[PDB]
Symmetry: none
Subunit: 253 residues, 6 copies
Amino acid sequence: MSKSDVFHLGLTKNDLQGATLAIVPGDPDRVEKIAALMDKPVKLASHREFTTWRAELDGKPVIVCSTGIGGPSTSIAVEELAQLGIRTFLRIGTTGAIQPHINVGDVLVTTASVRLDGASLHFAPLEFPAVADFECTTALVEAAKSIGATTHVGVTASSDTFYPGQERYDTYSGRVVRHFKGSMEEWQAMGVMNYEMESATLLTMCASQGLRAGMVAGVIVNRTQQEIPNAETMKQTESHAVKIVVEAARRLL
Amino acid sequence: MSKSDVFHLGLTKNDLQGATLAIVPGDPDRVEKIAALMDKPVKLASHREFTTWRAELDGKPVIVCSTGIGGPSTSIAVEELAQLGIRTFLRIGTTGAIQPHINVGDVLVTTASVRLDGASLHFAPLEFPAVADFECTTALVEAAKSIGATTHVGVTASSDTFYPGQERYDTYSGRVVRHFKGSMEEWQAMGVMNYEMESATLLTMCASQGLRAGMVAGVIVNRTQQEIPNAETMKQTESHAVKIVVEAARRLL
Amino acid sequence: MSKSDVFHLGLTKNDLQGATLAIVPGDPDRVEKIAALMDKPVKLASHREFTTWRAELDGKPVIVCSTGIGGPSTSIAVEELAQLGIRTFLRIGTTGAIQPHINVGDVLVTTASVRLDGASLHFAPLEFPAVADFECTTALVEAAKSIGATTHVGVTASSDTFYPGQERYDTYSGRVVRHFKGSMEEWQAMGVMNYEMESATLLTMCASQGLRAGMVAGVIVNRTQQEIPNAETMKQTESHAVKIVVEAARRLL
Amino acid sequence: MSKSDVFHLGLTKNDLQGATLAIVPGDPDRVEKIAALMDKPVKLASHREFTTWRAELDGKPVIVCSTGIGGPSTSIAVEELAQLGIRTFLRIGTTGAIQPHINVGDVLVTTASVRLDGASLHFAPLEFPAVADFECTTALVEAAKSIGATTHVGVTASSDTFYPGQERYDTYSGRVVRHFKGSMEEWQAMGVMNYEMESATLLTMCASQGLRAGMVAGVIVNRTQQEIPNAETMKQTESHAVKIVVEAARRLL
Amino acid sequence: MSKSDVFHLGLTKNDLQGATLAIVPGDPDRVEKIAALMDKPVKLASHREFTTWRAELDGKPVIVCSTGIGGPSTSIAVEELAQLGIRTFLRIGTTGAIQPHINVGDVLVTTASVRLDGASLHFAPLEFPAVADFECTTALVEAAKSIGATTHVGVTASSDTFYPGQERYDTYSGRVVRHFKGSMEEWQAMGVMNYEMESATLLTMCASQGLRAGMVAGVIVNRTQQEIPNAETMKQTESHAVKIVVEAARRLL
Amino acid sequence: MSKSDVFHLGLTKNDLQGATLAIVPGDPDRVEKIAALMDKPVKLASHREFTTWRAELDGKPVIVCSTGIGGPSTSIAVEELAQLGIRTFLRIGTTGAIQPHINVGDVLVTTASVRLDGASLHFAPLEFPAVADFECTTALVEAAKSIGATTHVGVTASSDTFYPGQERYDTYSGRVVRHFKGSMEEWQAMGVMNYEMESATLLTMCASQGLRAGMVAGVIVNRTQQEIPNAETMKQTESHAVKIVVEAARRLL
C-alpha cells in the first residue's frame, strides 16, 4: 500500500492564495452563507462534506471551509488546511446549552473544552488542555460587543457521540447510559456552558503547534425552556454568530 | 414535527415500511451502487452525511444509509435508524490489509474489532467485546463462498484517526500518539487483517439489542505485498463486495 | 541450572501421534466420559487437574485433556497442547445463565467473552477482542442443532472471581462488592448470556493466529427465577453438551 | 428456587469443627505434608483443586486447604473457608527470588505485594494497598528467627501469569502483551523480592476487612546465579518454610 | 487556634473587610514586597505557611496571601479564602523557560496548564481544562503593557517536583518515573513555555465555580541557552512582575 | 530560596554530623517542641516551614526537620535530607479518623497507605504498595502499647485534597465532589481508618529507595462520632503522639 502525496478537500495551495486565515464551521450548507457577508466570495471545491469558499475581507483574503461531523472529519480538514498555509482557525457553530441562565440567541466564546472525544488523543494526550488562542478569544469577545450580543465566555464540553449524560434529550434508552449517566449535572455544576462535538480536536490540534484557534457559537437550543426557540428566533441566532466571526477575523487579518 | 434539539435524519418510521435490515456504506456515492441490485429503489430524504434509500429484496423492503466518516457520525446514524425500526445492520466498505496473505481482491469478513477509539466507550466499557452477530456473519461467509471469492474471516482494528502513527499515513509526527509507540508490527503479529475507523463503534453499539451487525470489506490495497494492486483491481474488488452484502442481506430476512 | 525448567503438566513428544484438536474440559473427572464416546480411548497421562486421554474419530486421533480452574491454569494447559502440536481447541463446561428466557438444559455457544480476568492481558491489550473462531464456533452450532437441543449463542462474561456484580450468591461481605456493584444489571441488560471464568483467557490467547477455539456450555442453572432446579436431570444435561462437543470435533477433524 | 449454589466443591461447618486459622498451600500433596505435622490429621473431602485436611495444634483445629493455580481458584478457597468460618489465613509456597543478595534456602516474608494480577481488582481498587496483616507477619518473622532462617522481610511481585522479561528463563512467544517489560532490573531496582501468582489477590481479599493473611515462601532458586542444583535442599527449603508456617500459625489462633 | 467545626491556619471574615481580590504568590517574603506598592498595608496573620497581608488599592480592601508549595497547599490556601469571600485569584511567580525564544526579563502569562499533577483530579475528571479566566488574563497582558515588558501568553506545564524530564540536574538515585522522564523534550515540541507546580490545581478549581484566576510569571532563567543570566539584573524581573500584578489587580476591583 | 545549580532549601552534611534518622512533622513550630525532649537541642535553620534542629538522643544526633503540606514540600525536605545520609524517617502529626470505633485521642500506626495522591507516582507506579518498613513500624507499636496509648494498626487513605470523600465538611461547595462521591464510606467498609496528606509520598518514596519509613499520629477528630472531643483533647494528643516518636526512634538508632 503505497501512495503518492495526498487526496481530499480539493484545494491546491495556490487557490486560497496566501489566505492564512480560516473559518471552519461544521455544516457545509453554511459555508456559502458566511462567504456572502464578505467581498468577492468564490466556490473553490466541494469534495464530500469538505466545502471550500474564498472571499476577501478588507483587501485581505480569508478562507471559509467546512468540516463535517465528529473529530475525525475535522482533523482531516484541518490537517490539510494547515499544510495549505493556514495558521488561524475560527469556528462558528450553533450549539445547545446546559446552563439555565443561558438563553437562546446568545453567543458562546469557548476559552477551552472538556475533551470527551478520541481523535484529539492522537495529537496531544488526555493531560494537555484543549485551550483556545488568546488573540482569537479576544477578537471574538470584543467583536461581539460591537454587535450587541450578550456574549457568554467559558467552558464547552465536546463529545464523540450526540452528548451523553442525563439532560433529557428524549434519550433513546432501555439500557440507559454507560459510565456517562450522571455526567450532565456534573459539568453543569462545573460552569460548563454547552455541549458540542468538534472543538476538542480543533483546539487541541492547534494548541499543540502554531494554533490561533477559537470557537464562537450561538445557543439555538437550551435543554430546559419549552418552545425555545421559535423558528424565527432560531435562525436569527445563526446570523449574529456569523457577523461576529467574520468581524472577529477582520480583527486578526 | 421535529425542529430543534434532535432531528438529524430526514426520516420517519412510515418511510421504512418494515426494513429491520439496513446496509450502511461509507460515502453516499456507494449507497446507490448497492441500491441497484434490488427492486423499487426510492431515494429517501437525504441530509448532511447521511443518505437513506429503500428497496425490494425478495419482496421485503430493505434500506441503505451512509454513515459519514468515523464513529461519531457512524453512531449518530445507527442511533437514528434503530429508532425508526431497523434492527439488523450490515456495513460494507473497501479497505486494505496488513497481512501478506490477503491479496487485493480478497473479501475480509470481520468477527471482532480491536477497540482503539472513543465513541465505542459511550456505549460499552473498554472491556465488553465489539463482535459481529452470529446470524449476520454466517450469511456473509456463505454468500462469499457462493461466488467463490477468497473470504478471510478475522479481526479488524479501528483507529479513530486517519491511519496515522508510523506506517506512513497522514496526521503528523513529532508527538505521534504517545501510549502506542508500537503498533503496525504489533497488530500484525496478532492476526489483525486490516485498519479502518467505524468498525469498532458499530459492532459495540449493536451488541446491546440490535445484535445483528456484520461487516465485509474489499481489499483495495495491502502494504505487506505492495505491488499487486495492478490496473483497476478496485473494480472487481468493489463489486464483489456489493454482491456479497446484498446476498447476505437476503439470507437474513 | 535448569532441572528442565518446564517440568510441567502432561506427556511429551508423540503420544498424541498427529492429533491437532483437543477438547479441554475443566474437570478431569469428565475427560473419561468424553473419550469413552470416541473409539479406542487410551489414557495418556495424568497430573493434578490434568488428565489426558487419546481416543479417535473417523480414523483420526483427538485428544481430550482437562485444564483446571481459573485462567492461570488454563494458560499453561493451552501453551502445552499447542506446543505439542494441537492447533484446535474445544471447551465445554457448565454455567449459570443470567438471562430469564435461557433456562435449564440449554446449550450456550459463545461468540466472544467480556474480559474480567487478568491472564489474557499477558497476551493482548484490553482492546484486542476475546473472540471465538468461526469454523469452530459454527461446528458447535451445527452439532447441537443436529442432536435435538435448544442452543442459545452470544456473549459470556469471564470473571477472574466466582462472579461479582450484584446477584444471588450469599458471600461473606467485608467491603461487600467493590466497583463491580452495578455490573450485574449492566451486562444483563447489555445482552451477555452468562458468566464463566476461563473463557476470556482461552479465547484471547488463541484469537491471534492458531486460534481455532470455541466454547460449548450446558445450563445447569439460571440466576433469574424462584422455581426449579430439576434435580436429577441436572447432570443429564452434561450428557447432552458432551455428544455435542464430540460432534463438533468430528466435524473439525 | 432454592438453587443451592452454596458450596462450589467443599465442606460443612462441623467439618471445620470450630477452626479459625487455615494454612493454605497450593497443591494437595503439600496439604498432607503440612497436616502431618499437627495432631490427629483428618482428610475431610477432596474435590477438584481443593483438598481440605483437619488437624489440631495445642488442642486447637487448623484447616489446611489447597489453593490451586493463581488468584482465581485461591479466591474461591478464602471465600469458601471464611464462609464456613476462617478468620485468619496463612499462605506458604516456594519461590525463586530476583534480588541478587537473596540466596537460595533463604525464606522471604512479604509485608506487601505489587499487584500485576487481575482478581484483586475484584475486591479493592489498584490504589488500595494489598497489604499483609500486622500480626500474621511478626508471627512469621518471629518464627523464621526461631528456626534460624535468614529472613528477608519485604515486598513481592504478584502477576497471575508470565513475568514480563525477555529472560534467560524461557519465553514462549509468538505475540505477547501491550505495554510491559518492566519486570527486569525495574521491579528489582525498586528492591522487590520474588514473583508470586497468589499473593496480591490473597492480600487484597483479606486487607479489605477480616484480614489476617500472611505469606511466607521458601527460596529454591535465585535467577541471578547458575550454581545449582542440590538434591534435597529444595525439599529442605520445603521443610524449612513448612515448619515456620505451622509454628507461626500456633502463635496466632 | 482549632475551635468548634474548623480552624485551618488562616484568619476571619472581617480582617478582610472588602475581601474579593487576592494576589497569591509563593514565598511569604514576596507578600511584604507586594503590599508595599500599595497604601495602608496592614499585616494580619502569618499562621503557618500562608501569610496574609491586607492593604487597599485605589481605595478598596485588597489581600495578599502565600499559597505554599505545590497543589495540595495551593488548594488549602484557595479554600479558606474563597470561604471568606475572595472571588478573584492572581498568581505572580518567577520561572524558567524551555523555549529557546524567551530570554530573561520576559513575562509569561498563562492561558491553560498541562494537568501533570495529582491535586486537580480531586476537582474535575482528567478531561477538564485548567484554563485562566478571560478577565484576569486580559488584564494581565494589558497591565504588562502599561509597563512595556515583553509578554508571552501561553501553555504552562504543571506537575509535582522540580522540572521533570532530563535537565543538567541531580536526579537523586532513588526512584524517578520513566513515564514522565522523557516528556520535557516533548512539551517543548508541544509549544509549552515553562514548568510550575501550583497552576494545574489553581486553575482546575476556580474554574469550578471558584470564580476567577489568572497567572503572571517573570523569566529569571532559560535552560535552553547558557550565557544568561546577567545575575545582577534579576532583582528587577520580579520587580516589573510585582508591578504588573498590582496594575492588573487595580483593573479588577 | 534554592540555587542556580540544584542546591535548595536546607543546609549541609558539614553540619548534620551523624545522619541516618529524621523525625519529620508538619509545622515548623513542632520541630523545636519535639526537639525539646532530646539532648543538646540546637536550632540549625529555617525556611518555608523547613525548620531544622539537630538534637541528640542517647548518643545519636537525631535530626528533626519539616516537610510542610503535601507530597511536593515533603519530597524536597526528604529527598535532599536523604542526600545528607538520613536513610530512616519517622512521620508524626495529628489526624481525623473515620472508623466509628475510634475515639479522639489514641495513636494510629500506618502499615501502608491507599494512594490518593500525585507525587508518589513519581517514585513508583500505582501498583507498587505505599508500604511502611516493618522495622520502623514495629518500634512504633512497641512504644504506643508500651505506654498504653490506644494504638490501632491499619491502612490510611492519603489524599492530596484535605481528607476527601466529604460529608458535612462544609466548604464553598457547589459541585459536591468528583468521583470521591461516597469514596469515604467505600474506604470505611473496606476498613481504612484515617485520612492524611503525606504518608503516601513518604511511605512510597522511602519504600522503593534506601528504605525505612515510619508513620504515627494522633486523633483529635472522628469524622463520624460527633461529640468533640475526648475531654477537650487537642493539645493533649500532641503530647501523646510525640512521646511515641522519641521513644520509638530510640530503638532505630
